[PDB]
């Protein structure tokens, strides 16, 4: 026995410590085989397009286009106003503004009161 | 260290506070109280423009050493006697500071002993 490793979000579990790789079933082997099959099909398509002498252009990747489209333009049509989104939007978009307003307003009120009472010592403060 | 152990592990009031030292009148021990003598005047000490921290009671030896250093330039080990003289004067200054520390400590000892004897006489 040895002290156990505890995985986290930013330090994931090693593959050699996965119990899932020791629970081997025929269905698991079939899933692995068909995953390799689809990877092989994609690799064959890419390599046929890549080794072609005739082609003189960037090869188009549908996966990259889908990624960029999902990140940019598919956002709003799938947006739904929910309590979670409404609350997070209100917080993240309004709270910082009022926090900084309070901080700066308090600071400037303090400075203005000090100036009016004359106890600030602004000697040599010529450029503003 | 031993004074740190004495003050921090033993009785704090038994030992001087370096920041607030001295706490007793200079004439408390003996009434002679000869004054310290300074050799370098304000003007020449300003003309030599030593530093505000080198402007101490050993400044004349520093001025002489600087004169040697400037005068015999290429031979940078020519004037070592005056370096020794300045170092000796600084040594004597440090010894005087140590004597001040010791005197304050012994006066504190004696004052606390007076307080204990007076308290014993009052309780008896």
């Amino acid at each position: 026995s040895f002290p156990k490793y505890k995985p986290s979000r930013l330090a994931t579990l090693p593959a050699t410590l996965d119990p899932a790789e020791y629970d081997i079933s025929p269905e698991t082997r079939k899933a692995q085989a068909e995953r390799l099959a689809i990877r092989s099909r994609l690799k064959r398509e890419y390599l046929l397009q890549y080794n072609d002498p005739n082609r003189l252009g960037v090869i188009e990747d549908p996966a990259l286009i889908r990624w960029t489209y999902a990140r940019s333009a598919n956002i709003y049509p799938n947006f739904r106003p929910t309590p979670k989104t409404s609350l997070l939007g209100a917080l993240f978009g309004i709270g910082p503004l009022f926090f900084w307003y309070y901080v700066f307003k308090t600071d400037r009120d303090k400075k203005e009161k000090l100036i009016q009472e004359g106890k600030l010592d602004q000697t040599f403060n010529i450029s503003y | 260290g031993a004074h740190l152990a004495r003050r921090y592990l033993g009785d704090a009031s038994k030992e001087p506070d370096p920041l607030r030292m001295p706490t007793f009148p200079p004439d408390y021990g003996f009434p002679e109280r000869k004054e310290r003598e300074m050799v370098a005047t304000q003007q020449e000490m300003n003309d030599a423009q030593l530093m505000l921290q080198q402007r101490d009671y050993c400044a004349h030896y520093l001025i002489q050493l600087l004169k040697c250093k400037r005068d015999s330039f290429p031979n940078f080990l020519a004037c070592k006697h005056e370096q020794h003289d300045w170092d000796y004067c600084e040594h004597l200054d440090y010894v005087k500071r140590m004597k001040e520390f010791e005197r304050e400590r012994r006066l504190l000892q004696r004052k606390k002993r007076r307080e204990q004897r007076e308290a014993e006489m009052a309780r008896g």
């Binding site: - | 021990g29 170092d87 004597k99 005197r103 006066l107 004696r110």
Partner: protein
Amino acid sequence: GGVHIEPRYRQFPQLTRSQLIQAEFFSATMWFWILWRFWHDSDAVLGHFPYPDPSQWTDEELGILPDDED
């Protein structure tokens, strides 16, 4: 701009006498310098001015009275 030295394959590499003598000379120079400086300036290590004993000073020079006057 050096000379040709072939690899050796599991044997000690070929050495020039020049680098050996230069390295020995510079090590000897460092040790001679240390010995010379210690011989001439020993106070830089062991000190020159003795440290006085604070408890060995008599009460006369410290302005201490025999616990009865003031």
